[PDB]
């Protein structure tokens, strides 16, 4: 019953040496407070994400872990939701649900999002007053860009932001019932939005393409589109994107050489998203459940037991990324990071987010190449969704 040096918040601002300590001896071990087997190496994490033996059907288990002794009946909104979205379903249902939303994520769509995001990022960074000298990059940039991308790339109506953001914030973090009510709000909003009963959806956006494709859907139901749209809203306004932006900004702030590498060579620019994502996973760990007994890292994981796959540790496994603690844009294989997961449930917005990141650093660094930290960066108290709460920055 030895507690794990994970679980405890003290490691959040810099969890990587701890990950290393543990990975040396105990790459797979029990975490008392997560009710789960933590797995830490790249090999076993990738294996975990690809394995048809671990199920994504994990709502009951994760909810147990997060709200002990507070079970929910199968017809409760949380369970219907989990049963009807890509995140918590296995093939073949998962594949049908995934195919039902591909209209927003085609090659052509991303061709458009590229231009849109170039624009948005440039306007954001250009909006910084010419004599600024100091900034907290978290509220000013990292928290702001995903919102603007949500409006102009995804198609969330601007006027509806004030409805959606507090509700996702509540969901992501008081009471389980309040969270359930907010999730219900997200479903009802998705439903009414598609019927034109809410804000105006800008054209050529994700939600516009999704809406136009509803009449052509044959394997899935309107209800399932509502569920998945609720999921989309949650991921859209989660701290994951701002966390990536801010952690990357901090990485550049502490690595001038990579700033000049960035400004000189287009290769570095094109690898920037992947290297930032590798250096700090916004989602430090994701969850699985063993459908059957699995043998991993020298451990017999029993059927029904929960697994915590530490993508953040895998991104800095020296077995896969030589000198993993270095922020390096010339790195050959940054694209092998697990920050977007891997295989079946690989992040639906991976390319959109990569575009957002790239253009953000292009715009930031073509105006402020002389960025430094001006005081200690402050991290949130959570490891699972790890992100900077404050990043004080001197621009000039
Ligand atoms: C659209 C909206 C959206 C956005 C914005 C996002 C953004 C993001 N994302 Fe995401 N995702 C998503 C949507 C999303 N997403 C979905 C829907 C999913 C599921 C898929 C499947 O399942 O198939 C994911 C998934 C996912 C995963 C996997 C998990 C598992 O497997 O379990 C990960 C790791 C991630 C991450 C992420 C990050 C880090 C970010 C920032 C940077 N993602």
Numbering used by the authors: 2 to 174, 184 to 406
What do the authors of the reporting publication say about this deposited model?
Cytochromes P450 superfamily (CYP) is a large and diverse group of enzymes containing a heme cofactor which participate in a variety of physiological roles including hormone and secondary metabolite biosynthesis, as well as xenobiotic metabolism. Until recently, six proteins were identified in the Thaxtomin A biosynthesis pathway: TxtA and TxtB are non-ribosomal peptide synthases; TxtC and TxtE are CYPs; TxtD is a nitric oxide synthase that produces nitric oxide from L-arginine; TxtR is a cellobiose-responsive pathway specific activator. TxtE catalyzes direct nitration of the indolyl moiety of L-tryptophan (L-Trp) to L-4-nitrotryptophan using nitric oxide, dioxygen and NADPH, which is the key step of Thaxtomin A biosynthesis. Although NO-related nitration is not an uncommon chemical process in organisms, particularly for tyrosine nitration, TxtE is the first reported enzyme that catalyzes a direct nitration reaction specifically in a biosynthetic pathway and thus it can potentially be developed for industrial applications.
In this paper, we report the crystal structure of TxtE in substrate-free form. Although gel filtration results show that TxtE is a monomer in the solution, two molecules are found in the asymmetric unit. TxtE presents a typical trigonal-prism like cytochrome P450 fold with a length of ~50 Å and a thickness of ~30 Å. The N-terminal His-tag, residues 1 of chain A, residues 1 - 4 of chain B, residues 175 - 183 and the last residue of both chains cannot be observed as there is no clear electron density for these residues. This structure also contains three imidazole molecules, two of which are coordinated with the iron atoms of heme. However, two B′ helices (B′1 and B′2) are separated by an inserted loop (residues 69 - 77). Two B′ helices together with B′2-C loop, F helix and G helix are located in the distal side of the heme, and are involved in substrate access and binding. In both molecules, the F-G loop (residues 175 - 183) is disordered. A clearly defined substrate access channel was observed between helix B′1 and helix G which can be classified as channel 2a according the common nomenclature. Interestingly, in the structure of TxtE a continuous hydrogen bond chain from the active site to the external solvent is observed due to the I helix distortion. Compared with these two structures, TxtE shows a unique proton transfer pathway which crosses the helix I distortion and is nearly parallel to the heme plane.
